[PDB]
Amino acid sequence: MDIISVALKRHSTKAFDASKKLTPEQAEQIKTLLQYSPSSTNSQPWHFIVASTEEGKARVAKSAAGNYVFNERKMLDASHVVVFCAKTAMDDVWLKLVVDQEDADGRFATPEAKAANDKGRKFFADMHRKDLHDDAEWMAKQVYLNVGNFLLGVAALGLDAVPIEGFDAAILDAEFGLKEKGYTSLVVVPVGHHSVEDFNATLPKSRLPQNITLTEV
Amino acid sequence: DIISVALKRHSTKAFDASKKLTPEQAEQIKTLLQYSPSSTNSQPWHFIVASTEEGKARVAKSAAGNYVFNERKMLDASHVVVFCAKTAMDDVWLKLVVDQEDADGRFATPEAKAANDKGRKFFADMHRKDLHDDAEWMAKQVYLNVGNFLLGVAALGLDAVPIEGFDAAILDAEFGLKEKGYTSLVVVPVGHHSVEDFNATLPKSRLPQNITLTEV
Numbered sequence: 001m002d003i004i005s006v007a008l009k010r011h012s013t014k015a016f017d018a019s020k021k022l023t024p025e026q027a028e029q030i031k032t033l034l035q036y037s038p039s040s041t042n043s044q045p046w047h048f049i050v051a052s053t054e055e056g057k058a059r060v061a062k063s064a065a066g067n068y069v070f071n072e073r074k075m076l077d078a079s080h081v082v083v084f085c086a087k088t089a090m091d092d093v094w095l096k097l098v099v100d101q102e103d104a105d106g107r108f109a110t111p112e113a114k115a116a117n118d119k120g121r122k123f124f125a126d127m128h129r130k131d132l133h134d135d136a137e138w139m140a141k142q143v144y145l146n147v148g149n150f151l152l153g154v155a156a157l158g159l160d161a162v163p164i165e166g167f168d169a170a171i172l173d174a175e176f177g178l179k180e181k182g183y184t185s186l187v188v189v190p191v192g193h194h195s196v197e198d199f200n201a202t203l204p205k206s207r208l209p210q211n212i213t214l215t216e217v
Numbered sequence: 218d219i220i221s222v223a224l225k226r227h228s229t230k231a232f233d234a235s236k237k238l239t240p241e242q243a244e245q246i247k248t249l250l251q252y253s254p255s256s257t258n259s260q261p262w263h264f265i266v267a268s269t270e271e272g273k274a275r276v277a278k279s280a281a282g283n284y285v286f287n288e289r290k291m292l293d294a295s296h297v298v299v300f301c302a303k304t305a306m307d308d309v310w311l312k313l314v315v316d317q318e319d320a321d322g323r324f325a326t327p328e329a330k331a332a333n334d335k336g337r338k339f340f341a342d343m344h345r346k347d348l349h350d351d352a353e354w355m356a357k358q359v360y361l362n363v364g365n366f367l368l369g370v371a372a373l374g375l376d377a378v379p380i381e382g383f384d385a386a387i388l389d390a391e392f393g394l395k396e397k398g399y400t401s402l403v404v405v406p407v408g409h410h411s412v413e414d415f416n417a418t419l420p421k422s423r424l425p426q427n428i429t430l431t432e433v
């Protein structure tokens with residue numbers, strides 16, 4: 001159908017069926033969704049852990065303890081589990097990797113246009129690094145943009161999903177060694193198919209009216 | 218198919234002033250803004266949709282100084298949405314959300330209404346008092362909306378560009394957002410590209426999955 005149908009009909013799944021796996025093609029398509037999300041200046045300030053085995057999901061599920069025990073079941077029972085990570089600092093080696101990938105994909109005709117896109121990236125990166133001191137927050141903002149893109153995308157592939165903020169970030173970071181690699185875990189997204197125990201599957205979707213949230217000029 | 222539109226969508230650098238959104242598309246854009254997910258269904262956002270030429274000129278005042286190159290995008294596109302975040306998560310908004318969830322029939326019992334208001338307040342209180350990051354937590358949810366929106370309009374057949382290149386302090390003052398309790402974050406012109414757009418025929422570039430993705 002159309003994406004409005006998908007947007008109105010998708011939901012946060014509260015229980016997954018562990019026997020209902022992603023097809024081999026959907027498993028590749030969810031990775032394509034992760035990579036091809038936009039970001040500010042194409043900065044792509046992210047890493048993804050995609051857990052598809054029982055071991056790998058159990059390693060992710062260490063993060064759902066303490067206050068966050070209600071999220072353990074979803075991390076273990078979903079087919080694939082995506083951990084969305086931000087960079088800890090925006091470094092010049094990574095700003096170079098972005099410009100040199102844009103070059104190799106053939107986006108600049110002139111070597112002057114290569115320099116003009118590196119300068120434009122630098123003006124944005126240095127605004128957040130040197131002046132406003134919020135580069136961790138700026139990069140995290142892009143990862144959340146990615147999550148939004150990902151949630152509608154997987155729903156349009158006919159897959160179920162739930163975004164999770166309810167996990168321990170220090171525990172997940174320690175398990176995959178993210179801090180020394182230069183990353184922090186932000187959102188965990190289990191993807192798969194819902195079970196009959198998903199009570200949110202049949203409940204109506206609720207949002208604030210547009211006369212509170214939206215102004216037309 | 219959604220993979221086709223994810224691979225085929227572009228950030229458009231120039232818009233056609235004469236190509237307008239249909240009445241159907243204008244409504245569908247507002248629907249996508251409204252029905253995006255957020256943490257705890259907190260929905261900590263406001264949207265300004267500028268469709269008149271007077272409204273789009275008020276938005277374009279934010280791109281005056283350092284960002285003159287972004288003014289043409291805000292003026293020529295059919296609809297221009299400014300995504301705004303809440304400055305503080307107050308108890309009136311938390312009650313507005315749970316009462317709307319109640320009126321829409323999401324709770325079987327008044328106990329489950331209480332347990333959802335409690336489960337929201339736990340996460341909301343954690344972010345202001347303990348982690349000191351309530352403004353950026355809410356800003357994160359609005360950025361999640363932008364991601365939902367961009368793929369959504371791409372799949373409607375419409376061109377979009379997300380813009381951080383504006384002056385948020387000028388936009389905030391222009392629409393009175395500070396005293397209303399909101400701050401401007403992203404401006405997204407929606408429309409169709411002009412016949413002089415260089416980005417539309419240009420290949421997409423992303424880093425390879427062997428850099429960005431670990432499988433376990």
Ligand SMILES: Cc1cc2nc3c(=O)[nH]c(=O)nc-3n(C[C@H](O)[C@H](O)[C@H](O)COP(=O)(O)O)c2cc1C
Nearest residue numbers: 010011012071163164165166205254255256257258
């Ligand atoms: C960033 C983020 C974090 C969330 N964290 C959780 C979570 O820890 N557990 C859960 O069950 N739902 C979680 N949700 C789901 C929200 O409760 C849900 O998106 C919201 O109530 C709207 O419902 P819907 O997604 O069914 O439209 C989260 C949503 C977002 C966007």
Ligand SMILES: Cc1cc2nc3c(=O)[nH]c(=O)nc-3n(C[C@H](O)[C@H](O)[C@H](O)COP(=O)(O)O)c2cc1C
Nearest residue numbers: 038039040041042145226227228379380381382403
């Ligand atoms: C939050 C955000 C802010 C952006 N700001 C600008 C901007 O001010 N000007 C611009 O020309 N492009 C801007 N972009 C577009 C990016 O350069 C673009 O998303 C990126 O190069 C990837 O290209 P694509 O969107 O065609 O896939 C922004 C993107 C995002 C997601």
Ligand SMILES: O=C1Oc2ccccc2C(=O)[C@@H]1C[C@H]1C(=O)Oc2ccccc2C1=O
Nearest residue numbers: 014015070071165166256257258332336340
């Ligand atoms: O509906 C919710 O949305 C959230 C959004 C952001 C952060 C935290 C939460 C929650 O704790 C719950 C409560 C919640 C609940 O009351 O019961 C459940 C039973 C099974 C699986 C999951 C849940 C929940 O997440």
